[PDB]
DNA sequence: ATCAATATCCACCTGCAGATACTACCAAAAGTGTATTTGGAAACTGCTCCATCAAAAGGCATGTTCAGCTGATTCAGCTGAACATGCCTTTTGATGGAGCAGTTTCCAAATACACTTTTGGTAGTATCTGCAGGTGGATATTGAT
DNA sequence: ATCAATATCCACCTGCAGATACTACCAAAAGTGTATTTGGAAACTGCTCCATCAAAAGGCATGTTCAGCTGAATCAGCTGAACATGCCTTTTGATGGAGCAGTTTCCAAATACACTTTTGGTAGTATCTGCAGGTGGATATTGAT
């Protein structure tokens, strides 16, 4: 009965987004999923320790910039980055 | 009566399997030796079937990965012939042992 | 009521990814753009792969994404690759790969 | 007819394995080295997993258990969970 | 002069323990420090995962115990289990 | 006013690592029995490591246990040398190993 | 400030017998002769690497100092966690 | 005039370089290489002596260790002389390449 | 070369295992209004870090010499690849029930907060002691003969 | 074997850096003692989904045959080890200057927290279809001759 999330309809969201007229199977969202929780895990992990290491109590936008480039490989690093970004931008001039 | 070289099928059997994605070992002689060794750590378990698919994935795609090693260590040492010091070298590398 | 994720330009949870960095004991507080940051940079990274999935499935005369499409997505990118290098994916395979040594003369 | 669990991973089926790992010729005696390697690699996968079980005070492996084992051996798995 | 704590000061009363005559050297002292340090994170830290699995919020000496026989080889978390057990036991009954 | 570590039988700090689990954001609340069998896990561990070090100190002929004689401690005991096996300790050198076949004659 | 000299092929002061030095140390006996820059240029992509990272540690807590501290962070991310510098 | 074999003063160096712990890279031109690299990174950065000896340590272990994988992969091929591509197989093996 | 055996590719067909779609709650995001908490922005220290200069040795560069290792070549013998099939092991699908998971309860044990006490860190001076690096000089080890 | 060159060993011996020793200040812990909150163990039990097993399914054990691979043996060429010789660069240890880590004290902004609305996201249910297999026939590949 009771709920159990997943991140398998930002994941389709995206999936249009991308390629309009693709499906997906039930496996192929399940290794989706692990991406994401995967990614997720990593990168919340560098922020913590980057927190920790400059005494510092809070996780900001930096961290976990930071924890992008150390974790992920130039290009991706790069874009990443810059998607990153643009969100936060768009997120605060937006009244 | 018609016959294929020595190589020839082996390299058929090449093409197919890294064509396809199926497991490669059977189920449940897989699944036996799952619970047998189980065994050992604790009495009376039970295992999700989605466990043991898990695990089976798990194995095949480590065995898969130490046999492109070991293939590499066989053809290092100008041989086209798997052998156990292929095997043992390549673990010895990847520190999973000695 | 707008949701952070609309306001952020974004299809993945702003909201929920808040809620898992709090509650995944990562730090005391948690600032307010880092979880739309977060969130873009899992976006992000989710289209690249389906991009590339996307691609293989087309390429094999299919519609519907299986995980051989991101087996090989993956496997046939330096840099996912290396970011996935210690990551098996159920049911991908592998590469068609053979040493040239192994092929046969004549 | 009876015989050992580890025999049911049978010649063929390593066969099979080294082939989709790109394998042209095999020595005879790769089917006993690779039996004691998987072994091993399950030994070590089970016996984290178990430790998950009993941790969690069930009777029944699942595959989170398994997933997280994998895990922490450094064979982190996706798709079944996590 | 911001005070830099240390293992240093346990580590020699156990040095003298085990060995009565025998002296350590700072760097050998440094890298003593660093193992503490190094084993305290990692068991810490397969508690905080194995406490989140398992939807707890607290890390008690069940969540050690656990995190301990993961972490270490056979022997060494056979007699580390029992120290472990030993002092949590006799600090119970010691107020 | 007794030490908790004297309470638990421990020469290693209970207060001091019962703050650390705090501060290291690993769980919401801390059970008062992690920090008494986290510290003397701890302490075995270093007297485990002393006690073959004391012993390499020993052998070669030394009163003060240096870097090298940490190394050939935990090298030389493979339970240690797996558990500190992706660790490197400065100034510890290697164990003295030379292939048999690099040796002369036959 | 006034000037501060280019550094240029660094490299090569990884010198041929500091390179066999440390094959020794490595149980190594017989050395081909392409072994050094071979060498030279797997260590100069260890050393890009773990310094890159320290770097981003020094970085992002605003130094213009690189730490011990930072490489030896870096260094455990890297998994060749380092003893015997702090941490 | 007296000579040792092929061979001969190689294994007294393996027992010399085994035996003791101190660096094999000469300090400063290690120093350079560092302050180079790191300079491509970024101008105008500084570093503690104890980065450097930390990095120094860091590297040597790494070769070192490199090298007896390396050596293994040799003695592998039935040879004793270890060559790249030795230094080739045992990086790919390792998941560096 | 030619020629047959057999694998492989491609077009087309189709039932249904497995997607996609829809509904309808409702936990959990978002909105609102205080109640803390924090990371700087300025404003100073005392450091480590950089630079540089001189002296000195200790190790590096180079050229010569030839020992013995590598890689090419040949080859014989062993050892794994290929092969047909019914015996038997695994796969498949059907059915009790073990136990995971839902839910509620309640107190043993957790955090919180304000005192009180104690210890572990450093800094100032002082002493000490292990052993690094130097010295012969007695005991191997290696390689020519 | 025996002999000579030279590396190795070991043990004793003085200078001294690094270690141990107080001494003493003290600030930050750690401890102690109520007041307050609650996480999760305990106990009951619904209902998946797991072990078992009967019939249906199709992969593997086997023994023979010989193609071709591995390893042994031989050897010519040349690469890499050893060593002598000439001196550049690293090491060591000063000295000065300053660029900058590292603190401390005030707040303005930012984030948490308790309390209400207001959905977006899930499980349960209902349609819809991509494509896994099947066949049929053409063509490519391999191996014999
Ligand atoms: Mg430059």
């Given at each position: 009965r009771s709920r159990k999330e997943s991140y398998s309809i930002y994941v389709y969201k995206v999936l249009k987004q991308v390629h309009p007229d693709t499906g997906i199977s039930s496996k192929a969202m399940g290794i989706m999923n692990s991406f994401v929780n995967d990614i997720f895990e990593?990168?919340?992990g560098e922020?913590?320790?980057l927190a920790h290491y400059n005494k510092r109590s809070t996780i900001?936008?930096?961290e976990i910039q930071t924890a992008v480039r150390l974790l992920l490989p130039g290009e991706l690093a790069?874009?990443?980055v810059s998607e990153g970004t643009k969100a936060v931008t768009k997120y605060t001039s937006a009244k | 009566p018609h016959r294929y070289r020595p190589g020839t099928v082996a390299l058929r059997e090449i093409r197919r399997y890294q064509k396809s994605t199926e497991l490669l070992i059977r189920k449940l002689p897989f699944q036996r030796l799952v619970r047998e060794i189980a065994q050992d750590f604790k009495t009376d378990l039970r295992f999700q079937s989605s466990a043991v698919m898990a695990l089976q994935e798990a194995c095949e795609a480590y065995l898969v990965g130490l046999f492109e090693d070991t293939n590499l260590c066989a053809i290092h040492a100008k041989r086209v012939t798997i052998m156990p010091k292929?095997?043992?070298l390549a673990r010895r590398i990847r520190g999973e042992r000695a | 009521?707008?949701?952070?994720?609309?306001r952020a330009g974004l299809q993945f949870p702003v909201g929920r990814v808040h809620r898992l960095?709090?509650?995944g004991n990562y730090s005391e507080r948690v600032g307010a753009g880092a979880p739309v940051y977060l969130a873009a940079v899992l976006e992000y990274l989710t289209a690249e792969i389906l991009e590339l999935a996307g691609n293989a499935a087309r390429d094999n005369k299919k519609t519907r994404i299986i995980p051989r499409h991101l087996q090989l997505a993956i496997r046939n990118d330096e840099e996912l690759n290396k970011l996935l290098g210690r990551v098996t994916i159920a049911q991908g395979g592998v590469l068609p790969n053979i040493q040239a040594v192994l092929l046969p003369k004549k | 007819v009876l015989r050992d669990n580890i025999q049911g991973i049978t010649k063929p089926a390593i066969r099979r394995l080294a082939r989709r790992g790109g394998v042209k010729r095999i020595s005879g005696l790769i089917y006993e080295e690779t039996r004691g390697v998987l072994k091993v690699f399950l030994e070590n996968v089970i016996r984290d997993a178990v430790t998950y079980t009993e941790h969690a005070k069930r009777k029944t492996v699942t595959a989170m258990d398994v997933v997280y084992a994998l895990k922490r051996q450094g064979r982190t798995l996706y798709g079944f969970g996590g």
């Open positions: 990593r990168i919340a922020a913590s320790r900001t936008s930096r790069k874009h990443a | 292929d095997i043992q | 009521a707008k949701t952070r994720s609309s960095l709090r509650k | -």
